[PDB]
Amino acid sequence: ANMHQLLTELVNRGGSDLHLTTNSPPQIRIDGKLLPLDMPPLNAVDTKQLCYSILTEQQKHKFEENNELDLSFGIKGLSRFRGNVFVQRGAVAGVFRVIPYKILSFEELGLPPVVRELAEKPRGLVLVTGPTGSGKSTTLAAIIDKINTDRHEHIVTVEDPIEYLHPHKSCVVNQREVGADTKSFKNALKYILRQDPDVVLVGELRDLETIEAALTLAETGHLCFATLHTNSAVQTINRIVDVFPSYQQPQVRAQLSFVLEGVLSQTLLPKASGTGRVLAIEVMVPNPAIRNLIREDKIHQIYSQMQVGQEKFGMMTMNQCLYGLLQKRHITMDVGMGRSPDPDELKQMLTS
Amino acid sequence: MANMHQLLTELVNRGGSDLHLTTNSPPQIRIDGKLLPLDMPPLNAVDTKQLCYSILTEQQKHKFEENNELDLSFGIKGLSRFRGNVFVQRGAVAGVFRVIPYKILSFEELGLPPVVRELAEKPRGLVLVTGPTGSGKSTTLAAIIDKINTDRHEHIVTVEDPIEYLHPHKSCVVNQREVGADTKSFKNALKYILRQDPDVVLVGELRDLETIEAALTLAETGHLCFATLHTNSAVQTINRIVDVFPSYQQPQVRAQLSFVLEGVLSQTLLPKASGTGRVLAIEVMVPNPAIRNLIREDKIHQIYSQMQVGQEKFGMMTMNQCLYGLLQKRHITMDVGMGRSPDPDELKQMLTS
Amino acid sequence: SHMANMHQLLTELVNRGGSDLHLTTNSPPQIRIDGKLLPLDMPPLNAVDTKQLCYSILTEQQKHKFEENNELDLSFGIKGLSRFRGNVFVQRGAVAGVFRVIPYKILSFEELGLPPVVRELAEKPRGLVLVTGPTGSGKSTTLAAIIDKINTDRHEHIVTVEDPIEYLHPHKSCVVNQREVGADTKSFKNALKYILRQDPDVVLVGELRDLETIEAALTLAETGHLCFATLHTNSAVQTINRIVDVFPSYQQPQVRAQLSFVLEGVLSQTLLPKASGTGRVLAIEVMVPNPAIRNLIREDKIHQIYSQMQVGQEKFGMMTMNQCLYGLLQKRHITMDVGMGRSPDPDELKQMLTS
Amino acid sequence: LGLPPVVRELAEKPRGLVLVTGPTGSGKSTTLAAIIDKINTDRHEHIVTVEDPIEYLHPHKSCVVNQREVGADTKSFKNALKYILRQDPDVVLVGELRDLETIEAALTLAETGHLCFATLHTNSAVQT
Ligand SMILES: Nc1ncnc2c1ncn2[C@@H]1O[C@H](COP(=O)(O)OP(=O)(O)O)[C@@H](O)[C@H]1O
Ligand SMILES: Nc1ncnc2c1ncn2[C@@H]1O[C@H](COP(=O)(O)OP(=O)(O)O)[C@@H](O)[C@H]1O
Ligand SMILES: Nc1ncnc2c1ncn2[C@@H]1O[C@H](COP(=O)(O)OP(=O)(O)O)[C@@H](O)[C@H]1O
Ligand SMILES: Nc1ncnc2c1ncn2[C@@H]1O[C@H](COP(=O)(O)OP(=O)(O)O)[C@@H](O)[C@H]1O
C-alpha cells in the first residue's frame, strides 16, 4: 500500500521515472531532472520491502539468483510500468519507468506538417533519430497510426519491447516483440520478406546486417522505418555509411540516395514555463540535389542544401527550429544556444 | 579480528602510507617511503591468514582461495576506509593495505587544468581517463563524479572493482555497484544499466572488447560515460580502442568513437623538484570537427597534428606542451621532462624555439 | 634404508661440490661436477632401485601426482644438509630422477668474479637491469647477490616472481615476498597483474618470455621501480635487439624509446672452465647506458652501441666480453683456446693480446 | 523476364559453374528457375537443388528433380553437399556461396563434369 502511493505520486506529478535507493528519499524524474520527494530517506529494509511488494514469488527467486531482474507489471486503474531491481552497496535498489499507452497527434507532439506527409510515402527508408527519450517512439507511433488509419496494407513492427499498441484500423498490423514473439531482430528480418509486408518498423540501425535489411526492404518496394541515436541529418547519413568497409561504401551511398525519403532528428528541451518539454526537430527531405550529393560522396555539403529548402519542401535545420522556438519564447536563449550545432549561425539568424 | 583493527589504527595514527603483513617479519608500515617494523614478534603463517581473513566476506574468501589473488576495499567505522591486496607467497598469505581518504580533493588541489572542470559539465559523451596503475586516475574521477553530484539533478551509476571513493547523495542519486558482491560482473552490470535510467556512468577499465561496446553504446545513446585505460597519450588511447576489435567491425567502432568521444586525459605522476611529493603531468585531447572526421576516416596519425595548435581556445594540451610549462615553472627537472616526453626532439624545439 | 641411501647419495653430491645428481636404470648414480657428469663408484641401478630412491624423498600426495602423470617437479629439504629441486619422470618403463642443489649461502661479488660496477647496480632507485646468458651461466647467482645487497641496505619492498623459486631471501632491512609460479601464483601474467597493487619497490620478473612480460617490466621501470629480468642472449646489443624485435614493426618505435629511458644495465654472462682444470670462472660483458647509448637506442642505431662500449671502461665501469676475456687471459685464469672459443670477434682479442 | 538470348544458351551447357549474382531481390531465383526449367524440359538427367528456403517448385519433366529445403529436408548446406556426389547428380543448385566450404563444393562439382549453379551478392562479374 506504500508502493501504490509512490507510483500514484509518480503518475500524478507527470514524472517519467521513480528511483528507490538507500539514504535518499524516493526521487521522481520530471522533465528530465530528478526531484526528491518530501519524505524521510529510505534504508535497506525499506528498499527491499518496497521493491519486493511489486514482485511475484517466482520473480523474487530469479532476482536473488543473479542480483538483477527485468520485469513489467500493471497497477489497476493507473498504468503499466517497467521495473529494474538491482543491488548496490549491499542493499536493494529499484528503478520504475512509466509505459505510455495513448498515441498523441502530430500537433500535440509539436511535429511539423511535413511529418504527416511522410506517412503517405509508398516506399523508401524513413529514419527517426536522437538520444534516449527524444520522442522517437511517439513520433513513430503517430506515423504508424496514420498509415493504419489511411491504408489497406500490411504493417509489421519488430520492437524491443513493444511500446505503443496499434489495433487494426484499415491496415493489418502485426507487432513482434523481441525476446517473446521472435528470438531476435536478425531472426525477425530473415522471414519478414516472406510475410507480405508493406510497411515495416525495424527499430535501431544497430549493425551492418540490420542496415542491409532496411535498405533491401526500402529498395524492394516497401516503406521501412528505423531509428539511430544521431542528432542531425548529416551525422545520421554518415553513421550508416561509415559502418561499412571502404570498398563497399559506394554501393551503400548509391542505395541510400535512392531509398532515403526523410531524416528526423529530435530532441526534447525544457519549456521556458518550467513545466513540460517541447520538441526540437531537424527535418531533411531529400531533393534531387541532395540525392546526387550522397552518391558523389559530398556529404559535408548537405547541410548547406538544407538551408534553402524550407519554403518549398518543408525542410528545417535544427537552428531554424530553435529560431522559431526562441521567437515564440517556448525555450530560453541558454537552452537554445546550448543545443544549437552552430551558435554563430543562430546568433546571426536571431539578429538578421 | 580486533587485532587487525589495531594495526590499521596504528598505520593511520603513525602517518604511514602502507601496511605490510608477511611471514617471518612483524607487521611493517611504510613511513616517508621507507619500511619500518613495528615493535611486535614476527608473524607466522597462521597470523597472516587470520589477520587478512578478518576483513574479508565469505565471497571474498572463496574468490581469494580460487585465485590466490584479491583486490578489495573496506571501512573501519570511525577511522578510515582502506584498499587491500591479498596474495600468496612461499605457501603463505600476505597482505598490503593502503589508506583511502574520506575527503575528495578539488581540481585545484589536484593540479588539474580548468578544462577538466568543464568536462564534468558535459551532458553526453565518452570521457577517458588513462595512465598506468596508480597514476592518479581514480583521484581525478572522484573529483569529477563529486562535482556532478553537487551540481546536477541526475542519476549517476558506478560499477567498480572495487569501489574506492564513496559518493553519498548530494543533488544526484548515486548508485555504486561493487563487482563480486552487488553485481556478478561488469558484463552483467552493463547488461542492465540501460534499463536503470542512468545519466552518468563510470565503467572502470576498458579491459576487454565487450566493455568497450557497452561504453560506446552508453555514450551514443545520450549518457555520459567515464572509463579508464592504461595508455599514456591520446593517439595510443584511440588506437588501443579501435584495434582490439576484429578488422571487419573496426569501421563501426571508428564511427561510434568519432561520434561519442568528448575528452581523453592521460596522466602520469612525476616527482616534485623539492624531493617530497608528486606533481601531475597530463595530456588533454578535446575533439574538434577535424579530429572526429579523422577518426571516422581511419586517419589516426593526423589526430596528433591537429592537437599542437588548439591549446589556448579549448584547453587542449599535448604532453609536450604540459611538460614545457612544468619546465618553465621549474617544477620538474630536465631528465624527468625528457624522460617522459614522447618526442624529446619536439620538446627541444619548443625550448630553444 | 632406501631413505638412508637417498640421503647418502644427496650428501655425497654436496660434499663433492656437484651440481646435479642423476638416477636412472643401468647406470650407477652420476653427479655433474663443473658441467660434466662423473659416475660414483657403485653398481648400476635397476628399476626397483630408482623408484625406491626417488620415492624416499616424496610426500604421499607427490607420489600420487607423479603416478597420475609420469611427471613431477618438486622441491624439498634435508635437515642439516641442503635443499634440493627434484624432477622425477619415466623412461624405458622405469623411474628416473634428477636432483639439483639450491645453495643456502650467497657468495660475495668478488668471489663470483663480478666487477665493482655490479655492486652499484644494487643501489639504483629505479630502472630495468637485465642479466642474460645460456642456461647455467650464473644468472640466478648474480641476481641473488644483487638482491641480497638491496635486502641488506634498503628498507623497501622486494617482490620476486619465479618459476621456480631458487634462492630464498630472509627479510633483512627489506621486506621480501617471493611468489613461485604454479603454487603461490597461477602464472607470471597473473602475478604481474597485481604487482602494482602490492606496494613494491624492487621487482624480479624472470625471463622476458613474451610481450606482456616485457610491457610489464617496462611499466614497472617507468613508474619508479627497480625491475630485474633475464634473457638468454649473449651480448648487450643482442639483448637489446631481442627485446625490441619481438614486437610488431609499428610498435617498435615506442619500445626503443621506452628502453632508452629505463634501461640501467645489461650483464651477459658465461661460465668457462678454468685453466687449472677445476672449477669455473665468470666471463661477463657489462653495458651501463650513458647519454650516447640512450640516443643510439632511440635512433634505431643498435648495432653501433658496441663501439661506445669499447671506450667507456675507465669512466662508467663498462666492459665488453672481449675486454673481460683479455683480463682472464692475462691473469691466466683461462686457456687461449677457451678464451678464443668464446670471443665474438677473435681478431679483436688477438690484437688486444699482442698490445 | 527480360533476359538476353545468351542466358538460354547457358542452360544448354553440359558442365561447369554458372553464377547468378546481385543484391537481395534482384531477380536471381527467378532467373535460375527459368534455367532449371529449360534443363528439366530438355535433359534426361538428375537435378538436385538445395535451398533455404525453396522458392520455385519444379515438377519432374524429362529430368528427375529432387529439391531439399534446409531445416526440413536436410540439416544444412554442409550436410546436403557431403553426400551429393553419392546421389548421382548431373545438375546441382547450391545456393549462395556464403563460405569457403560451399565454394569448394561448387568448384568440385563443376570440375568433375557436372553443371553447378550458385549465387553471390556481388554486383559485377569482376567483383564476383
Ligand atoms: N514530440 C513530443 N512532444 C511532446 N512530448 C513527447 C514528444 N515525444 C515524446 N514525448 C513524451 O516524452 C517521452 C519520451 O518519448 P520516447 O518515445 O520514449 O522517445 P525515445 O524512444 O527516443 O526514448 C514519451 O513518453 C512522451 O510522453
Ligand atoms: N595530481 C595529484 N596530485 C597529488 N597527488 C595525487 C595526484 N593524483 C593522484 N595522487 C595520489 O596518488 C595516489 C593513488 O592514485 P590512484 O587513484 O590509485 O591512481 P590509479 O588508480 O590510476 O593508479 C592517491 O593517494 C593520490 O593522493
Ligand atoms: N659467478 C659465479 N662464479 C662461480 N660460481 C658460480 C657463479 N655463478 C653461479 N655459480 C655457480 O654455478 C651454478 C650454476 O649457475 P646458475 O645459477 O644455475 O645460472 P642460471 O641462472 O643461468 O641458470 C650455481 O649453482 C653457482 O653455485
Ligand atoms: N526479371 C524480373 N522481372 C520482374 N520481376 C521479377 C523479375 N525477377 C524476379 N522478379 C520479382 O522480384 C521479386 C524479387 O526477385 P527474387 O527472385 O526473389 O530475387 P533474389 O533471389 O535475388 O532475391 C520476386 O518476387 C519476383 O516476382
Side-chain angles (χ1 to χ4, degrees), chain A residues 316-326 328 330-333 335-336:
Chain A
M316 179 170 60
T317 70
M318 177 60 72
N319 264 346
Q320 295 173 324
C321 183
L322 295 168
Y323 173 88
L325 295 176
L326 286 162
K328 296 182 231 168
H330 288 81
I331 62 176
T332 60
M333 187 61 60
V335 164

Coordinates of all heavy atoms in Angstrom, one line a residue, chain A residues 316-336, unseen atoms left out:
Chain A
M316 N 14.0 21.8 -42.6 CA 14.2 22.7 -41.4 C 15.5 22.2 -40.7 O 15.5 21.0 -40.3 CB 13.0 22.6 -40.5 CG 13.1 23.4 -39.2 SD 11.6 23.4 -38.3 CE 11.3 21.7 -37.9
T317 N 16.5 23.1 -40.7 CA 17.6 22.8 -39.9 C 17.3 22.9 -38.4 O 16.3 23.5 -38.0 CB 18.8 23.7 -40.2 OG1 18.4 25.0 -39.7 CG2 19.0 23.8 -41.7
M318 N 18.1 22.3 -37.6 CA 17.9 22.4 -36.1 C 17.9 23.9 -35.7 O 17.1 24.3 -34.9 CB 18.9 21.6 -35.3 CG 18.8 21.7 -33.8 SD 17.2 21.2 -33.3 CE 17.4 19.4 -33.5
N319 N 18.8 24.6 -36.3 CA 18.9 26.1 -35.9 C 17.6 26.8 -36.3 O 17.2 27.7 -35.6 CB 20.1 26.7 -36.6 CG 21.3 26.7 -35.6 OD1 21.1 26.5 -34.4 ND2 22.5 27.0 -36.2
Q320 N 17.1 26.5 -37.5 CA 15.8 27.1 -37.9 C 14.7 26.7 -37.0 O 13.8 27.6 -36.7 CB 15.4 26.8 -39.3 CG 16.4 27.2 -40.4 CD 16.0 26.7 -41.8 OE1 15.6 25.6 -41.9 NE2 16.2 27.5 -42.8
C321 N 14.7 25.5 -36.5 CA 13.7 25.1 -35.5 C 13.9 25.8 -34.2 O 13.0 26.3 -33.5 CB 13.8 23.6 -35.2 SG 12.5 22.9 -34.1
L322 N 15.2 25.9 -33.7 CA 15.5 26.6 -32.5 C 15.1 28.1 -32.7 O 14.7 28.7 -31.7 CB 16.9 26.4 -32.1 CG 17.3 25.0 -31.7 CD1 18.8 24.8 -31.6 CD2 16.7 24.7 -30.4
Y323 N 15.3 28.6 -33.9 CA 15.0 30.0 -34.1 C 13.5 30.2 -33.9 O 13.1 31.2 -33.2 CB 15.4 30.4 -35.5 CG 14.9 31.8 -35.9 CD1 15.6 33.0 -35.6 CD2 13.7 32.0 -36.6 CE1 15.1 34.2 -36.0 CE2 13.2 33.2 -36.9 CZ 13.9 34.3 -36.6 OH 13.5 35.6 -37.0
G324 N 12.6 29.4 -34.4 CA 11.2 29.5 -34.2 C 10.8 29.4 -32.7 O 10.0 30.2 -32.2
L325 N 11.4 28.4 -32.0 CA 11.1 28.2 -30.6 C 11.5 29.4 -29.8 O 10.9 29.8 -28.8 CB 11.8 26.9 -30.1 CG 11.3 25.6 -30.7 CD1 12.1 24.5 -30.1 CD2 9.9 25.4 -30.2
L326 N 12.7 30.0 -30.2 CA 13.1 31.2 -29.5 C 12.2 32.4 -29.7 O 11.9 33.1 -28.8 CB 14.6 31.5 -29.8 CG 15.6 30.6 -29.2 CD1 16.9 30.8 -30.0 CD2 15.8 30.9 -27.8
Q327 N 11.8 32.6 -31.0 CA 10.9 33.7 -31.3 C 9.6 33.6 -30.6 O 9.0 34.6 -30.1 CB 10.7 33.8 -32.8 CG 12.0 34.3 -33.5
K328 N 9.0 32.4 -30.5 CA 7.8 32.2 -29.7 C 8.0 32.1 -28.2 O 7.0 31.9 -27.5 CB 7.1 30.9 -30.2 CG 6.6 30.9 -31.7 CD 5.9 29.6 -32.0 CE 6.5 29.0 -33.3 NZ 6.0 27.6 -33.4
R329 N 9.2 32.2 -27.7 CA 9.5 32.2 -26.3 C 9.1 30.9 -25.6 O 8.8 30.8 -24.4 CB 8.8 33.4 -25.6
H330 N 9.2 29.8 -26.4 CA 9.0 28.5 -25.8 C 10.2 28.0 -25.0 O 10.0 27.2 -24.0 CB 8.6 27.4 -26.8 CG 7.2 27.6 -27.4 ND1 6.9 28.5 -28.4 CD2 6.1 26.9 -27.1 CE1 5.6 28.4 -28.7 NE2 5.1 27.4 -27.9
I331 N 11.4 28.4 -25.4 CA 12.6 28.0 -24.7 C 13.5 29.2 -24.5 O 13.3 30.3 -25.1 CB 13.5 27.0 -25.6 CG1 13.8 27.7 -26.9 CG2 12.7 25.8 -25.9 CD1 14.7 26.8 -27.8
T332 N 14.4 29.1 -23.5 CA 15.3 30.2 -23.2 C 16.5 30.3 -24.2 O 16.8 29.4 -24.9 CB 15.8 30.1 -21.8 OG1 16.5 28.9 -21.6 CG2 14.6 30.1 -20.8
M333 N 17.1 31.4 -24.1 CA 18.3 31.6 -25.0 C 19.4 30.6 -24.7 O 20.0 30.1 -25.6 CB 18.8 33.1 -24.9 CG 19.9 33.4 -25.9 SD 19.3 33.2 -27.6 CE 17.9 34.4 -27.7
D334 N 19.6 30.4 -23.4 CA 20.7 29.5 -23.0 C 20.3 28.0 -23.4 O 21.2 27.3 -23.8 CB 20.9 29.6 -21.5
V335 N 19.1 27.6 -23.4 CA 18.7 26.3 -23.8 C 18.8 26.1 -25.3 O 19.4 25.1 -25.8 CB 17.3 25.9 -23.3 CG1 16.7 24.7 -24.1 CG2 17.2 25.7 -21.8
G336 N 18.4 27.1 -26.0 CA 18.5 27.1 -27.5 C 20.0 27.2 -27.9 O 20.4 26.4 -28.8

